[PDB]
């Protein structure tokens, strides 16, 4: 998920 | 591991420095919807990097970090808006160039309902004369608490420490012991209402999905799918 | 105009009874069968709650319209926190009634019910970990009644009253903790811990609200007229 | 309304 990458 | 080792002023300055910026935006139904969702998507990116600065948030595993943000992203988004719109009574300051009315909320189906709840919260913050140091504490509390049940000993320790931080601010402000208890209670009761607006906002967001009005960014659809 | 002990005894005396269901553990449960039981139980508990609400110190002082609003907004919340309280010493189980003890697995007899079950189970587990007291329980239940609808509201001066008793229940909660021998810090933290639960309870209510609304539209089991009324307040 | 009635009792 993109949320992972931002984190 | 590291968050518990701060003073409250060290805790406050840690939160104040991590504050996300105020973004700008670029009315029909789909037009205002495009604006708000585009704004929310850009604010979401800042929130994530803000979350990684909340003392003790990094100490959690990547999965738990994801869960908490999935659960509270609309809450954190809303309490921020309510905070901005604090000194614009009867209005909502989504952006410095996007100040909206309760009447303008009628440009979208069922939007006006959530508007009044947001306006009521902003009015309440104004009545309580909420401080910026108190605001960043509540916003952090929501992040740590809203998803902590749907799973821990560490998160509560951090949560308990923010409570200590909140009390330090009030005791510093010259409030009596009783006034501190009551104000602490008054603040944390707002979060119950903010949760309610989030859930109402979540489904309204979902109704514009399926029944397509404006396309939504992939990041926004991801956060929206975490809530069924 | 009450002490906290007078406040607590007022709440403890006003406590609604524990009702039973017509459930007969001789036959298993379907979807509509378990639905009939829970909604029939919820309807009968609703009646008791209303008469309990009229005994919460200061509630009568409100107008009939505000009394209606608060109960309309918090009925499922007050309902749920009662369950969570009953199921406290039945880990992994939900005590809807003394004859109706349910499992997480039994929650899968109904579409989307299991999700709300885990949340209720998690809250019951949390109350157990915190070792919630009965005096603390009746306070929180009164807080939900006075707070959950106080925001969705000229002349008035009644909100100012609602916050007054609210602040008084806060004082009452602190007296209990201070009486228990907790340090000043432990009182603040425990007070905070308790009121943060109410955020989660609100979440379960909203999820629960939309759920049995689907049932009303899916038409699985008939719902009592009183229950449909409380449900229509939430659109 | 039923609630309207039940509270008046
Ligand atoms: O009812 C609805 C429906 C909908 O699609 C969105 C919203 C909220 C959008 C929003 C955007 C930016 C913010 O900073 C914020 F707090 C809220 C509310
Ligand atoms: O007496 C009580 C007490 C209580 O706490 C809960 C209930 C039932 C809650 C409920 C009913 C139907 C649903 O579809 C649902 F999702 C939840 C009943």
Outline the structure in words:
- It is classed as protein binding.
- Keywords: nuclear hormone receptor, transcription factor, ligand-binding, protein binding.
- The assembly is tetrameric.
- Crystal Structure of the Estrogen Receptor alpha Ligand-binding Domain in Complex with Fluoro-Resveratrol.
- The complex is a heterotetramer, with 2 copies of chain A and 2 copies of chain B.
- Chain A is an all-alpha fold and 7 residues long.
- Chain A is built from 1 helix and no strands.
- Chain A starts with a helix and ends with a helix.
- Chain B has a single domain, classed as Retinoid X Receptor (Orthogonal Bundle).
- Chain B has helices at 8-17, 29-51, 62-84, 111-128, 132-145, 153-172, 177-208, 218-225, and strands at 91-95, 98-101.
- The relative contact order of chain B is 0.15.
- Chain B binds chain C through residues 116-117, 120-121, 124, 141, 145-146, 149-151, 156, 159-160, 163-164, 166-167, 177-178, 180-182, 184-186, 188-189, 191-196, 199-200, 203, and chain C through 118-119, 122-123, 126, 143, 147-148, 151-153, 163, 166-167, 170-171, 173-174, 184-185, 187-189, 191-193, 195-196, 198-203, 206-207, 210.
- The complex binds 5-[(E)-2-(3-fluoro-4-hydroxyphenyl)ethenyl]benzene-1,3-diol (FSV) (2 copies).
- The site of one 5-[(E)-2-(3-fluoro-4-hydroxyphenyl)ethenyl]benzene-1,3-diol (FSV) has 16 residues of chain C, from helix 2, helix 3, helix 4 and helix 7.
- One 5-[(E)-2-(3-fluoro-4-hydroxyphenyl)ethenyl]benzene-1,3-diol binds next to helix 2, helix 3, helix 4 and helix 7 of chain C.
Fill in the keyword field for this structure.
heterotetramer; A: 7 residues; mainly alpha; 1 helix; 71% helix; 0% strand; elongated; B: 228 residues; Retinoid X Receptor; two-stranded antiparallel sheet; binds 5-[(E)-2-(3-fluoro-4-hydroxyphenyl)ethenyl]benzene-1,3-diol
